[PDB]
């Protein structure tokens with residue numbers, strides 16, 4: 001899968017240009033420090049919009065070779081140490097979505113939990129589990 | 140992928156014939172009757188349908204295929220969670236489809252007929268089709 | 279998909295030669311708890327499944343911007359839901375280059391202890407295609 005990603009700020013384009021360690025998942029960044037209040041879910045804004053592209057496949061069903069596809073949003077295994085849990089389990093981002101990617105993070109503790117810019121709680125994966133590439137693009 | 144689906148009552152068949160939110164890599168299933176979900180419990184909610192999934196044979200390393208039951212993105216606005224994260228429905232299954240919902244709040248939670256908490260999706264993430272049908276080949 | 283499991287003990291190698299609940303159709307390969315444990319109420323325990331493993335499939339073309347190894351998935355079993363145990367990271371994603379022990383992060387959501395027994399089955403391995411799975415016991 002290849003992803004085209006729009007950064008919603010220069011700050012965010014700079015952490016994506018310098019993505020160090022990059023797999024069948026693409027780690028997304030927490031982009032702004034933030035406090036997640038206890039026993040409640042926060043819709044964390046990852047400062048990014050993104051289409052996913054994939055080779056057209058033939059499938060059973062009662063215009064191009066390379067198709068706009070749906071993709072998934074997984075919790076990173078990391079999240080386990082944390083009291084944050086994905087409130088929708090796995091994110092499913094339909095092919096036609098053009099909003100910002102959000103991580104719906106459920107804070108299970110009775111305390112505040114603090115996330116920080118450059119934190120890594122979440123990752124994008126393809127329905128194939130195939131390796132992911134991305135380019136930075138302005139629209 | 141193509142779903143053949145048996146609706147287990149005329150109310151439910153109504154909902155699916157006039158299904159006004161399926162255009163899609165997922166297929167929204169409806170809550171079929173009002174329920175109060177006890178707090179901090181898990182409840183097995185019956186969805187009023189049997190469903191078989193069909194895909195072109197691949198070579199691994201038309202056939203019956205395994206498929207998935209995802210939470211809908213919008214369940215995140217509630218205290219409800221799929222106990223089993225993502226439902227895995229084997230190819231051989233012909234029973235009623237059921238969602239295991241955890242109510243994670245200290246208070247009861249009400250769900251209503253025509254609520255859409257859950258969706259069917261193919262392992263490929265491809266667009267889905269479905270017909271309604273009076274029964275499955277089971278004999 | 280095909281799996282090559284190295285069991286990390288002999289007691290565990292036992293479990294897998296005599297695997298009862300896998301047969302030839304399905305899409306999930308059940309994994310055994312491998313030793314008794316108690317999980318402290320309201321907590322997330324890493325539970326070690328006492329195996330390591332690589333998956334292989336017929337390679338295809340993919341967009342970028344024979345037999346290959348591949349990423350695969352650790353799902354909860356349907357049956358986990360009659361428990362207060364939940365998979366913390368929802369679905370484990372295991373990358374083509376993992377060569378360590380399969381571990382299962384389980385939250386206990388109980389305000390009590392929960393004893394997990396050897397030969398319990400809370401968790402299963404699945405392929406991205408949902409296709410049936412073979413396994414093979416291996417030492418390397």
Ligand SMILES: O=c1ccn([C@H]2C[C@H](F)[C@@H](COC(c3ccccc3)(c3ccccc3)c3ccccc3)O2)c(=O)[nH]1
Pocket residue numbers: 043073088090091092093094097099100101102103104212213214215216
């Ligand atoms: O894990 C996911 C899953 C879906 N989405 C996208 C795609 C979906 F159309 C849209 C759903 O938007 C949210 C929503 C909408 C209505 C009711 C509840 C929640 C959403 C975001 C994240 C997870 C689940 C749902 C949303 C979007 C923006 C702000 C708040 C909530 O956001 C994500 O970005 N992350």
Ligand SMILES: O=c1ccn([C@H]2C[C@H](F)[C@@H](COC(c3ccccc3)(c3ccccc3)c3ccccc3)O2)c(=O)[nH]1
Pocket residue numbers: 183208223225226227228229232234235236237238239356357358359360
């Ligand atoms: O998310 C899912 C996952 C699987 N299924 C199907 C296929 C599976 F065999 C069967 C699982 O049956 C339940 C079960 C099985 C074993 C141990 C405990 C519970 C089940 C259903 C739904 C979700 C999770 C578990 C079951 C069986 C009878 C009554 C209630 C629940 O139903 C669902 O409909 N939804």
Ligand SMILES: O=c1ccn([C@H]2C[C@H](F)[C@@H](COC(c3ccccc3)(c3ccccc3)c3ccccc3)O2)c(=O)[nH]1
Pocket residue numbers: 077078080081324352367369370371372373376379380381382383
């Ligand atoms: O469900 C899963 C998901 C991934 N993995 C693999 C791949 C990953 F690098 C490695 C990570 O193991 C844990 C980890 C990673 C980062 C930060 C903390 C902990 C892990 C395992 C299971 C669930 C969540 C996280 C890990 C590693 C060693 C000891 C304990 C836990 O295990 C599993 O075996 N089970």
